RNA sequence: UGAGUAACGAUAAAGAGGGUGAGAAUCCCUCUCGCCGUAAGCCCAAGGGUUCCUACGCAAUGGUCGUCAGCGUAGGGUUAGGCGGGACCUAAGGUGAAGCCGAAAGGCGUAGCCGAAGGGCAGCCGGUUAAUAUUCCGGCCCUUCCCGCAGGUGCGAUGGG
RNA sequence: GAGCCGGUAGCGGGCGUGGAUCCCUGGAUGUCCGAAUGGGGGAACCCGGCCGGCGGGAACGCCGGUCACCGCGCUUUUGCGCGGGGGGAACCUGGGGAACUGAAACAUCUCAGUACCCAGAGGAGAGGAAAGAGAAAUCGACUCCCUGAGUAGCGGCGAGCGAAAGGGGACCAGCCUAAACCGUCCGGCUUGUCCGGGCGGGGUCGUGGGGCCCUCGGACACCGAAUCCCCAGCCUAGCCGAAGCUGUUGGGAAGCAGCGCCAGAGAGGGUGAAAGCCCCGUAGGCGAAAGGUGGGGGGAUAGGUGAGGGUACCCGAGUACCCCGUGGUUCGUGGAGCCAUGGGGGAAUCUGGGCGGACCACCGCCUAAGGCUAAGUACUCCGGGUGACCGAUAGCGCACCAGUACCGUGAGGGAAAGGUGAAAAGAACCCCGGGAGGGGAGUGAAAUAGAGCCUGAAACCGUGGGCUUACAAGCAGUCACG
């Protein structure tokens, strides 16, 4: 319901490298506007938004055996703000 | 055997079994009846790993499925279930007067 | 919690209409769990979502009380 | 709808059949016209007051014109 | 059933060492041949929707094994101020306020719009990734446009030229 | 009523008789889509306005509302309320309109206004207040039945198709509009008096109404949505509810035994092998509450009607009649009724004008040309029930992760396969070996029932054995002797 959150963290080696600079890997809503992607990270999450890139992606690879299946809708969005902070609370597993 | 079922976790001897001499049940369950006479296990050789107890043929097995309880032990074995004395407001308890006159009641028991 | 709704029954406007936002956030926290905690939390995530609805609802349904 | 009388209708089902007759006379010849066809009326209008078409349809117009003229 | 005979998608031919692994003429490395080379090259655009990358997997399928594999188990992973297209355009064609017609569904089409390698329309090199990339980083670069400022100004409709 | 967090068993937990599940009813957001509606456009894409709201104000996006399109209602201030429009298995009515086949040809005929296509329709439709009818000097909506003969009927009198009256019975209701005629108020008109707007009266019913006069009227008929309420019933959930043990073989028993009961409920299905009384919320009977819906019953609502006589006259589509054209109705012109409409012409008010029976008469009936009309058959996609109807290559083609895969560009067509077994306790370890697999175990009453599995044959492939067979011609083989 028009709520702020739009995303979940992504986990690449590069994402792990993402914090060396501040790129930010997020599974996201399949229709988020960059600005939302701006503001969401903003008042919901508190930065000076800078640099964004984003990826729609159709789902990848599965079976069960007796019938057929392929992975459902998915999407990515990436970003890095100037100050060099935030999400340091959120990189924590690696 | 649907959303409606039968006996509570209960206390009851049974008959045909090769075990007869029952009493407390353990845990009644859904469409497959599923409850425990707390008599007769088997083994199941629960693999081998220590996540299992390490040298299995495990010991707790209690799923003698069919309904067959000689229900409840108030002072009687098997009975029909009549219904309820009620009296007090929204009371039922479908307390069984059949020979013995009890519901295996929530008051006295489970 | 027998009475999850009562305070929710109580709140009348934005004070909730904002509170929910934070209260939403409390569940925003719950997606962070790719593998940070995710233990007993699996309930903690669950019906905490449910209240939100009512928070929608009561807003809605008191906006129905409103109209 | 279109080409009815406008007040009413002439879009008739049209069946066409005949041959040759020879009957009150004596002998009888052959003919038969087990077939279908078409058969229909006429367009044209005039005026209400000021700047006007009309349209409507054929035979009634000989009556038809005056009614509006009678308003 | 005929048949282990026919067949094996090309007459453009590799060898051997070394390893690997339960088990290798086919698999990984070395070496030497061979052949392309006016393509069996690199590149984009239709095609299609996964491989590609890593580990284990061997019965499956690969027309043979096959520790290999475009096959499997799951995970991995490409985002554009300017690359292409869309927020511009419009031919035929299509569309359809009108307008005028059909047994009935229909007919056409004025005006405008829809619809391309057409047209108009804002850059480029190197670098590092397992994988992508002129959109990631570096350098350089110009961008329609907004506000705020200066300055000048006759300005203002896709109306007519 | 109290254990659960779909099919799926794991995997990590929880919430719980201070109802959660589960069902039932109204809730409230319901992405995108599609008649499709802000605007286009390759369905699941996109591009805005016009308001108010977030983002760092606006330059950039999000929010919610509103942004056709017809046709009407009219409020004839650029618009308002209000109308539809989409389908949907069948369903019928219109409108449309097909052959071969049948004629052992076949063009007339036929099948047949079928099939199909649209249009429309509502849960029914359509018809339905008599210019009947046919023959008593009738009857009085109709349709549905069956009868009414398939006679009476029609034609290349070929094959055919095929009534109605009557009779029985089903349900068994009928009323609204134009009448300058008057009033009315209103519009135009223009000097009033033509037409047009509403309102009254009438607006019929079967020959009456319109008007003047006289007796007149002193009220019952209930609604064919007249209106609402009430018994109103499904919906849903339900609750009962009777009552055997003991013994016994037995892999397992409710079978055998013995002794017992039950009952307005010995239907059925189930529990390890056959239960009237173990279970099945089995049927006897009873619920249910507020809703969400409605015939019977009931009431009030009764709009809407609810006297004869007098004078003559102003009254159901101007267009019916006729002619040539085709249509139907059993009716393809035969003389050709009727209703239909094709064109063509063209009259009038109950002194009518049509009828029935070519045509005339005469006889008698009927009073046409603006509409809604129930309940009555039909239909069964949905629900429920039912079973000399069906068993897994029968039954829809389909019985459970299908009309989905597959194939066919698309139009389409159109798969195969059910059951292990008391439950899984579905096989721990043991060893061969890469692994699968196989053996032991032990599991289990049966694993030669262990997952391509109840039980499993058919040919077809083997061995193990038995018997014979290497100098003979023979479908086969049968008989005779060894």
Curated annotation (Swiss-Prot), chain A:
<keyword id="KW-0694">RNA-binding</keyword>
<comment type="subunit">
    <text>Contacts protein L29, and trigger factor when it is bound to the ribosome. Part of the 50S ribosomal subunit.</text>
</comment>
<dbReference type="Pfam" id="PF00276">
    <property type="entry name" value="Ribosomal_L23"/>
</dbReference>
<protein>
    <recommendedName>
        <fullName>Large ribosomal subunit protein uL23</fullName>
    </recommendedName>
</protein>
<dbReference type="GO" id="GO:0019843">
    <property type="term" value="F:rRNA binding"/>
</dbReference>
<keyword id="KW-0689">Ribosomal protein</keyword>
<dbReference type="InterPro" id="IPR013025">
    <property type="entry name" value="Ribosomal_uL23-like"/>
</dbReference>
<dbReference type="GO" id="GO:0005840">
    <property type="term" value="C:ribosome"/>
</dbReference>
<comment type="similarity">
    <text>Belongs to the universal ribosomal protein uL23 family.</text>
</comment>
<dbReference type="InterPro" id="IPR012677">
    <property type="entry name" value="Nucleotide-bd_a/b_plait_sf"/>
</dbReference>
<keyword id="KW-0699">rRNA-binding</keyword>
<dbReference type="InterPro" id="IPR012678">
    <property type="entry name" value="Ribosomal_uL23/eL15/eS24_sf"/>
</dbReference>
Curated annotation (Swiss-Prot), chain B:
<dbReference type="GO" id="GO:0003735">
    <property type="term" value="F:structural constituent of ribosome"/>
</dbReference>
<dbReference type="InterPro" id="IPR041988">
    <property type="entry name" value="Ribosomal_uL24_KOW"/>
</dbReference>
<dbReference type="InterPro" id="IPR003256">
    <property type="entry name" value="Ribosomal_uL24"/>
</dbReference>
<protein>
    <recommendedName>
        <fullName>Large ribosomal subunit protein uL24</fullName>
    </recommendedName>
</protein>
<dbReference type="InterPro" id="IPR005825">
    <property type="entry name" value="Ribosomal_uL24_CS"/>
</dbReference>
<dbReference type="GO" id="GO:0006412">
    <property type="term" value="P:translation"/>
</dbReference>
<keyword id="KW-0699">rRNA-binding</keyword>
<dbReference type="GO" id="GO:1990904">
    <property type="term" value="C:ribonucleoprotein complex"/>
</dbReference>
<keyword id="KW-0689">Ribosomal protein</keyword>
<keyword id="KW-0687">Ribonucleoprotein</keyword>
<dbReference type="InterPro" id="IPR014722">
    <property type="entry name" value="Rib_uL2_dom2"/>
</dbReference>
<keyword id="KW-0694">RNA-binding</keyword>
Curated annotation (Swiss-Prot), chain C:
<dbReference type="InterPro" id="IPR001854">
    <property type="entry name" value="Ribosomal_uL29"/>
</dbReference>
<dbReference type="Pfam" id="PF00831">
    <property type="entry name" value="Ribosomal_L29"/>
</dbReference>
<protein>
    <recommendedName>
        <fullName>Large ribosomal subunit protein uL29</fullName>
    </recommendedName>
</protein>
<dbReference type="GO" id="GO:0006412">
    <property type="term" value="P:translation"/>
</dbReference>
<keyword id="KW-0687">Ribonucleoprotein</keyword>
<keyword id="KW-0689">Ribosomal protein</keyword>
<dbReference type="InterPro" id="IPR018254">
    <property type="entry name" value="Ribosomal_uL29_CS"/>
</dbReference>
<dbReference type="InterPro" id="IPR050063">
    <property type="entry name" value="Ribosomal_protein_uL29"/>
</dbReference>
<comment type="similarity">
    <text>Belongs to the universal ribosomal protein uL29 family.</text>
</comment>
<dbReference type="InterPro" id="IPR036049">
    <property type="entry name" value="Ribosomal_uL29_sf"/>
</dbReference>
<dbReference type="GO" id="GO:0022625">
    <property type="term" value="C:cytosolic large ribosomal subunit"/>
</dbReference>
<dbReference type="GO" id="GO:0003735">
    <property type="term" value="F:structural constituent of ribosome"/>
</dbReference>
Swiss-Prot record, chain D:
<dbReference type="InterPro" id="IPR027491">
    <property type="entry name" value="Ribosomal_bL31_A"/>
</dbReference>
<dbReference type="InterPro" id="IPR034704">
    <property type="entry name" value="Ribosomal_bL28/bL31-like_sf"/>
</dbReference>
<comment type="similarity">
    <text>Belongs to the bacterial ribosomal protein bL31 family. Type A subfamily.</text>
</comment>
<dbReference type="GO" id="GO:0006412">
    <property type="term" value="P:translation"/>
</dbReference>
<feature type="binding site">
    <location>
        <position position="18"/>
    </location>
    <ligand>
        <name>Zn(2+)</name>
    </ligand>
</feature>
<keyword id="KW-0687">Ribonucleoprotein</keyword>
<keyword id="KW-0862">Zinc</keyword>
<keyword id="KW-0699">rRNA-binding</keyword>
<dbReference type="InterPro" id="IPR002150">
    <property type="entry name" value="Ribosomal_bL31"/>
</dbReference>
<keyword id="KW-0689">Ribosomal protein</keyword>
<dbReference type="GO" id="GO:0019843">
    <property type="term" value="F:rRNA binding"/>
</dbReference>
<dbReference type="GO" id="GO:0046872">
    <property type="term" value="F:metal ion binding"/>
</dbReference>
């Amino acid at each position: 319901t028009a709520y702020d959150v739009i995303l979940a963290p992504v986990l690449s080696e590069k994402a792990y490298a993402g914090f060396a600079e501040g790129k930010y890997t997020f599974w996201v809503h399949p229709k988020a506007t960059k600005t939302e992607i701006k503001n969401a990270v903003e008042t919901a999450f508190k930065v000076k938004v800078v640099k964004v890139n984003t990826l729609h992606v159709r789902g990848k690879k599965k079976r069960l055996g007796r019938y057929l299946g392929k992975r459902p809708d998915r999407k990515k969005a990436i970003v890095q703000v100037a100050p060099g902070q935030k999400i340091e609370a959120l990189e924590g597993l690696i | 055997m649907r959303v409606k079922m039968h006996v509570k976790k209960g206390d009851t001897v049974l008959v045909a079994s090769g075990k007869y001499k029952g009493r407390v049940g353990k845990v009644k369950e859904v469409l497959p009846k599923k409850y425990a006479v707390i008599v007769e296990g088997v083994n199941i050789v629960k693999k081998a790993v220590r996540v299992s107890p390490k040298y299995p043929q495990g010991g707790f097995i209690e799923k003698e499925a069919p309904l067959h309880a000689s229900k409840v032990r108030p002072i009687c074995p098997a009975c029909g279930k009549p219904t309820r004395v009620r009296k007090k407001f929204l009371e039922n308890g479908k307390k069984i007067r059949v020979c013995a006159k009890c519901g295996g009641a929530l008051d006295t028991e489970e | 919690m027998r009475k999850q709704l009562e305070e929710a029954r109580k709140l009348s406007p934005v004070e909730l209409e904002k509170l929910v936002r934070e209260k939403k956030r409390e569940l925003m926290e719950l997606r962070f769990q790719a593998s940070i905690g995710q233990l007993s939390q699996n309930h903690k995530i669950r019906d905490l979502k449910r209240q939100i609805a009512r928070l929608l609802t009561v807003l809605n349904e008191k906006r129905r009380q409103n109209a | 709808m279109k080409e009815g009388i406008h007040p009413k209708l002439v879009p008739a089902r049209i069946i066409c059949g005949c041959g040759n007759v020879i009957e009150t006379y004596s002998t009888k010849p052959e003919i038969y016209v087990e077939v279908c066809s078409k058969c229909h009326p006429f367009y044209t209008g005039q005026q209400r007051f000021v700047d006007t078409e009309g349209r409507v349809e054929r035979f009634q117009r000989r009556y038809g014109d005056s009614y509006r003229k009678g308003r």
